[PDB]
Amino acid sequence: TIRSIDASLLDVLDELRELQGNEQSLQKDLDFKKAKIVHLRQESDKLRKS
């Protein structure tokens, strides 16, 4: 079916879906980095206390 019509559309959409997957991976990585920032905020008061 994809060779009857031009097959470039499927390749482009596969590239975009892989981009979406890796972007979502980077997004959850950013959320984990935010959680690390949260623990940094949780320890900044301890540093000031020290």
Partner: peptide, 13 residues
């Protein structure tokens, strides 16, 4: 690093 990633996932989507 936060805003650079936050700018993404919108243009991509």
């Amino acid at each position: 690093t936060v805003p650079q990633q936050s700018k993404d996932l919108e243009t991509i989507k």
